Design a protein around this ligand. Structure first.
Ligand SMILES: O=c1[nH]cnc2c1ncn2[C@@H]1O[C@H](COP(=O)(O)O)[C@@H](O)[C@H]1O
Ligand SMILES: O=c1[nH]cnc2c1ncn2[C@@H]1O[C@H](COP(=O)(O)O)[C@@H](O)[C@H]1O
Lengths: 431, 431
C-alpha cells in the first residue's frame, strides 16, 4: 500500500514512534492527524534516544516531509520548544516540518482551564496530561477556538484573543475562583513566534490529494490508542480526539477510500495511565515486574503506568474499528523470564454472561472479569533477535495464538527500542 | 459496492433524503453518522411528503433497519416528537429504528446556551438552527456531556445532570445574565422517555462489522454538506461536526477501509443558509428567481436560502475530500426557462491570482471573485424526465461539462422531489 496507516490498539504506549521511523525509509510524507502535545513517541537510532511529542516521528529523516494535519491541537510554545531541542541536535526541522492552516491553537488558558476542571472533579479525576488538549478541542467545536490561520492577520487576531480570553477568564475567576490568565503576555508570547510558524503552513488536503495521484508512499502516525477514543473509548476517561483510523480523513484532509493498510501496534502486554477501566490489570509481582521490566512511566508526565496481560477481548474491538491489516508486536522481551504468560480471551459480565465483545462507556466496565488461557513462558532471551528462528517455540507459539485469537497477522515483531531490533515478515508499504 | 455512502457537496440542501430513500430499495441498514436535529431531508413517495430531521431517511421502508451512530447528537424531545408524527402516519419507527449507546444527549440547556451565545456575537451572528447542536458536541469533547448510555442507571444520572446543569447555569445567569434552566423539569422530561429510548439501543460498531462480513448492502446518510465541515469548512460559519466522509468511520464505528463508494449529491445551482462566504452568490433576478423556482427556504427553520450558480471551484474541494465516485445531480428543472446557465471554473484572489483551489477559514474568502463559463440555457422542460434523451442537448451539455470540470461522473440525475422523477445511469450498490 502507498497509503499505509500506523496507530495504537491498547491504551497508547504501544510504540508508534519507533515504528513510524523504522518504516518511513521510503516515505515522502508522514502525517499527524490528531492529538496534541500528550504523546511521547520514542526513537532510538543506533543507540541515540529522541522523544517526540508533537513533532511527527518522520522528522529524523531527510527524504521525509513531516506534516501535521488539521486534526491536531497545536501549542505554539510547545512546537518552538521541541524545535529548539531538535535543532541543537542537528535536525533541520523548519525545513522538513509542514503544518495546517486549520489547526486550532493551544494557548496557556487552555492549560489553565484543563488545570481548573480536573480539580473540580476531585475524586473522579480523569488523569489528563496537563497539556490543555481538551479545552482547545472544546473551543474548536464551540467555534470560538483560534486557529493557525488566524495568525495571518495580527491586527484582528488580538481582537479575537481579547474576547476569547475575557470569556475564559470570567469563569476562571468567578466560577473556579482561580487567577485571571493575562491577555497581554499571551499575545507577546504568541507574536514572538507567528512568522516562524505561519512559514511552514500549507494546504495539506490538496497535498495528500496530489501525492496520491503520483503514488507517493505516505504514512499517517497516530497519537494514543483506540480504547482512549473520544467517541469509541472508555468514556469519559479518554482523550478528546478520535484516535481511531477514521481520524485520518478527518484530521488530515485525505479521502477515507485512499487508505491502503492500517497497521495496529500491539504491545505484548497491557498498560494504562490515567484513571479508567483496565480489566486485565495486575497488582501482584507480575504487575510491578512488568512495570519494571519495560520501564513503564508516562513519557511526558513521568506517571508510572499500570500493568496487565494482553487483553485479547479489548484488541478485537480495535481490530474491527480500525480495520487492521496486520499487527506490530512490541515489547516481547519484557516477557522474558516469566514462567507463564496468559492472555484474555473473553469477559465474564457482572451478571454471569461470558462474552467476547466489549462494554462502551466507563460505567459499563464496573464488574467485568478476565478469562485467561495460560501458556508456558520462557527463560530464553528474545532481546534484539531479528530472525523468527531466534525466538523459542514458546514465544513463537504466543505469536501464533494471537494471530488466531484475532485473525489478524502480526506482520512485525520488535525486540528493542532501537530501530534495528525489529523483524519484518510483511511490509505495509509493498503489500 | 456493498458499503455505499451518500453525502452533500455544496452547503447542504443538495437532496440527501430523497436519494437515500430511492437508493435503499436493497439496503439492510441505513446510518446517520453525524449531525443533530438541524437537517431536513425531504421525501416524496407517489406524491406524499415526509420531512425527516433526526430520523434516517430509510425509516419509510420495511426491509431497511435505520440506525443512528455514535457520531450523532440526540435531543430526546426531538426524537419522540418525530416518532409520534411518523407513527400516526403508519410508520413502525420503534421497530425499524436503531440507536447508539454512545450518542451524547441534547437537553434543553444545550438550546439555552446555543441561544445565549449566538446573541453575544451580535453582528457576527453565524446562523445556527437553534437546535442546541454546538453545545452538545462541545460538552461531548469536554467530557461532561451526558450520553444515551448514562440513561442505563437513572440513579447516578440525575446526580450528573445536577452538576452539569449547575455549571451551565452559573454562566447562564452570571455571565450571559440569562435565566436559569430548571433541573427538575429537565429530569422529569428526560425520565418520561428513557425506556422507550434505551430500548432501541445497540452496539452499532459490531453491527456494521457483522453486516460487512455477510455482505449486507449498507448506506450511510450525511447531514449538511462539506463546506460546512467543522474541520474543513468555512470556519467558523460552519457546523460543529465533521460532515466529511471521514465522519462515517468516526460517527458509526465502521473501519474506514470498508467504504466502497461515496456518492456526492450535487445541486444544479448553489444555496447557502446562515452567514458565511458564498462566492457565486446572486442578488439579481436570477438570484430571487432561483429562490422561487426551487422553493428555497430552510426546511427546519424556514429561513430563505441564498442563491448562486454551481460553483465548480468549491465542488472540486468536495471531490477530493470525500473521495467521490460519482455525482447525483439534483434540481435541474429549476434551471428551465433560463436564457443562459454559467458555472464557476476558478477564483480570482484579491491580489490578482487566478486559481482552481479554495481558501480555508472564513476570513480567507474576503475578496474572492467568480470566473464563469456561460453556456446556453433552455426553454424546454426537463421536469420529471426519466430518460437522458428527454433532456435537450443544451442541458445534456451542462452535464457533460460538469463531468469534465470535475472528472467525476454524474451517475444520477433527478427531475423532481418524487422518488420516481430520477434517472439512474450508474447504481452505487452494484458497481
Ligand atoms: O499518549 C498518551 N499516553 C498515555 N496516556 C495518554 C496519552 N494521551 C492521553 N492520555 C490519557 O488520556 C486521558 C485524557 O487526557 P488528555 O489527552 O490530556 O485530555 C488521560 O488519562 C491520559 O492518560
Ligand atoms: O442541514 C442544514 N441546512 C442548511 N444550513 C445548515 C444545516 N445544518 C446546519 N446549517 C448551517 O450550519 C451553521 C451552524 O449551525 P448549527 O449546525 O445549528 O450549529 C448554520 O449556518 C446553519 O446554516
Amino acid at each position: 500500500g502507498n497509503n499505509v496507516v500506523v496507530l495504537g490498539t491498547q491504551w497508547g504506549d504501544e510504540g508508534k514512534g519507533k515504528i513510524v521511523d523504522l518504516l518511513t525509509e521510503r516515505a515522502k510524507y508522514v502525517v499527524r492527524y490528531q492529538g496534541g502535545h500528550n504523546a511521547g513517541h520514542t526513537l532510538v537510532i543506533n543507540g541515540e534516544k529522541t522523544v517526540l511529542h508533537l513533532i511527527p516521528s518522520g522528522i529524523l529523516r531527510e527524504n521525509v516531509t513531516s506534516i501535521i494535519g488539521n486534526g491536531v491541537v497545536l501549542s505554539p510554545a510547545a512546537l518552538m520548544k521541541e524545535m529548539k531541542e531538535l535543532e541543537d541536535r542537528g535536525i533541520p526541522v523548519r525545513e522538513r516540518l509542514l503544518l495546517s492552516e486549520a489547526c486550532p491553537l493551544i494557548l496557556d488558558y487552555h492549560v489553565a482551564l484543563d488545570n481548573a476542571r480536573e480539580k473540580a472533579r476531585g475524586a473522579k479525576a480523569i488523569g489528563t496530561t496537563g497539556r490543555g488538549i481538551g479545552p482547545a478541542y472544546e473551543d474548536k467545536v464551540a467555534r470560538r477556538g483560534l486557529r493557525v490561520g488566524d495568525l495571518f492577520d495580527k491586527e484582528t487576531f488580538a481582537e479575537k484573543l481579547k474576547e476569547v480570553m475575557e470569556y475564559h477568564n470570567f469563569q476562571l475567576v468567578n466560577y473556579y475562583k482561580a487567577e485571571a490568565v493575562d491577555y497581554q503576555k499571551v499575545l507577546d508570547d504568541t507574536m514572538a513566534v507567528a512568522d516562524i510558524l505561519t512559514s511552514m503552513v500549507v494546504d495539506v488536503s490538496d497535498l495528500l490529494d496530489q501525492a496520491r495521484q503520483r503514488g507517493d508512499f505516505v504514512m499517517f502516525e497516530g497519537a494514543q490508542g483506540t480504547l482512549l477514543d473520544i467517541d469509541h473509548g472508555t468514556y469519559p476517561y479518554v482523550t478528546s480526539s478520535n484516535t481511531t483510523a477514521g481520524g485520518v480523513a478527518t484530521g488530515s484532509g485525505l479521502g477515507p477510500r485512499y487508505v491502503d493498510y492500517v497497521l495496529g501496534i500491539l504491545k505484548a502486554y497491557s498498560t494504562r495511565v490515567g484513571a479508567g477501566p483496565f480489566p486485565t490489570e495486575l497488582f501482584d509481582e507480575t504487575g510491578e515486574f512488568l512495570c519494571k521490566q519495560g520501564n513503564e512511566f508516562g513519557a511526558t508526565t513521568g506517571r508510572r503506568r499500570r500493568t496487565g496481560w494482553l487483553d485479547t477481548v479489548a484488541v478485537r474491538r480495535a481490530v474491527q474499528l480500525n480495520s487492521l491489516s496486520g499487527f506490530c508486536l512490541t515489547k516481547l522481551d519484557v516477557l522474558d523470564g516469566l514462567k507463564e504468560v496468559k492472555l484474555c480471551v473473553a469477559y465474564r459480565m457482572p451478571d454471569g454472561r461470558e462474552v467476547t465483545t466489549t462494554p462502551l462507556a466507563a460505567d459499563d466496565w464496573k464488574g467485568v472479569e478476565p478469562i485467561y488461557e495460560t501458556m508456558p513462558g520462557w527463560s530464553e532471551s528474545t532481546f534484539g533477535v531479528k530472525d523468527r528462528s531466534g525466538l523459542p517455540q514458546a514465544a513463537l507459539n504466543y505469536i501464533k495464538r494471537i494471530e488466531e485469537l484475532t485473525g489478524v497477522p502480526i506482520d512485525i515483531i520488535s525486540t528493542g527500542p532501537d530501530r534495528t531490533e525489529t523483524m519484518i515478515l510483511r511490509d505495509p508499504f509493498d503489500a
